[PDB]
Design a protein around this ligand. Sequence first.
Ligand code: HEM
Length: 294
Amino acid sequence: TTPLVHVASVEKGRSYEDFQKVYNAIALKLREDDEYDNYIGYGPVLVRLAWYTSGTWDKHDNTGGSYGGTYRFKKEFNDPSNAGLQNGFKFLEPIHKEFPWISSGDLFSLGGVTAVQEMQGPKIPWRCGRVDTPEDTTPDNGRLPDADKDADYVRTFFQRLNMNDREVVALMGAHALGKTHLKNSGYEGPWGAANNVFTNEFYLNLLNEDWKLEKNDANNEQWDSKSGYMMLPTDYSLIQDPKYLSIVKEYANDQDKFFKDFSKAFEKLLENGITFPKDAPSPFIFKTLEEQGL
Ligand code: HEM
């Protein structure tokens, strides 16, 4: 129906200190469960989870997004589009039990922020206030992007999330993290070498590696390199399109610029659909465990 408004409402009496504690719990668990996914750790899947939940947003009617924290996944994670995300939810369950006061949307988004920062990425300002909407669930059905498409598809798709060319290229840099798993999405292989360290490696690999279009064991095409890396058709489209290519080169040659742009685009992604009161607290910038000496 009519595009309802979602006003951020601070968890009763909570402030910076409370959220830094949740951040720390997530960060400590990331350090503890280091064996996950052949020692890649849960960092990447938490970032994917933050992106996926926020990526359901539609600027046209303000449905989906991170605010409600209530989703219905097609085939209950048994679909190529969402398979694997259950690992992120399982990881966050213990965190939510220790801090039952934090909303689901705040937890999912904070999980992504914490993961990026702990993996040495840029600081990502984060705002609290998302409110659970149990009577309003958002099916992920066809709301997230397909990986077997070209640049035109990518550009059009991201317009629904109100992201421009630079924002799209910056956000895609998160693929420096983790890997594709054949049993999950029908794609197999990591995008780079340091799977759990946030850097601009995604762009360097796109430009510097020798890519070959091959078919994986799920009969899907993907670009593979001799180094053992891979790129989805949508990732590779960033160097096939002349406008995207210019930006890829920019980030491949300026680590600081990429960090700054990613930080802005990621916060925007996590905040799409949310109306923050004029007197809402300012965004929080959490200290890493390293910065706290923990
Ligand atoms: C055209 C856009 C995108 C497409 C088609 C896409 C597709 C995929 C696919 C197929 C996987 C593999 C899932 C698996 O097999 O486990 C994946 C993983 C991942 N994606 Fe993307 N993605 C897109 C955008 C993004 C964005 C914007 C972010 C976040 C800023 C992101 C973060 C991640 C991360 C961190 C992983 C690794 C998860 C893990 O290792 O478990 N993706 N994505």
